[PDB]
Symmetry: C3
Subunit: 115 residues, 3 copies
């Protein structure tokens, strides 16, 4: 079966350094919690709120080991007044036997308010 | 096999009440037509046109029964001059044996013009 | 197994004619390289940078043969200062036996800089 794994985080400032640092952190956290192997990943969708323009969060996937063939693309999240600002989210589609109720979705930084 | 099920609707005003009411309606309609069980749903992607800011359409999934483990995320739809305004769309990825030509995609309200 | 196939292209001007011409070209190129049959396609996600408003890139799928039942939806790509302008991207999810490292992702026009 195929399951989606969600992840979310926030950054303090709109800079390449922080965006890449925290996006990388979010991804390693997801891979750690779910024991994810790159060949099992169907695709990955990254999104950012309309207040981040510094860099494409996907550039961080390059620092991971063996993830060069995983198709990734970046979308803009819906602008909702009063919603979480400066946020980066992940929707990783993977093949797994793990039941839907046991998938480890990851919420870090100020995005803990979403858990 | 895994198939995508599409859905679309529109709202008259940008308010939490109507957005949640019609998004919930759209989702129940999709679940009804396709006999969808939450454990069979891989992931769900909701999108809204750039003219809706009242609330995240996903907040409506909470009122459904047994859908708390289904990963959902909201994106902004491409702004196309002359396109359907005040619209909420769904891209539900599910496991099913039903042939691609027999999947019941749902178009409600002013979004009937898309069928 | 299910795999994502990525594609990217660019257009010179924001017009219906060029957007549809190059999006169609991108899609035929992907179908050619990967030997894609419409019944094997789970879903398709098209995205455009916030500088294209002429038409929905998905309107081009209509000119393809046997692709009327493939669920497709359009999102807006994240606005990144200095990123590729006037770009249309594809994230096609398909069923295939082909290893992740052998999937043919397609980058055309000024989007060759992404390969």
């Amino acid at each position: 079966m195929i399951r989606g794994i969600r992840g979310a985080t926030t950054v303090e400032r709109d800079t390449e350094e922080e965006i890449l640092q925290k996006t990388k952190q979010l991804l390693e956290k997801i891979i750690e919690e779910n024991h994810t192997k790159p060949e099992d990943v169907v695709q990955m969708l990254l999104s950012a709120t309309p207040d981040l323009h510094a860099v494409f969060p996907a550039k961080a996937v390059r620092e991971l080991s063996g993830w060069q063939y995983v198709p990734v693309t970046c979308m803009q999240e819906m602008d909702v007044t009063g919603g979480l600002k400066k946020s980066i989210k992940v929707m990783m589609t993977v093949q797994t036997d793990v039941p839907q109720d046991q998938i480890r979705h990851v919420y870090l930084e100020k995005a803990v308010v979403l858990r």
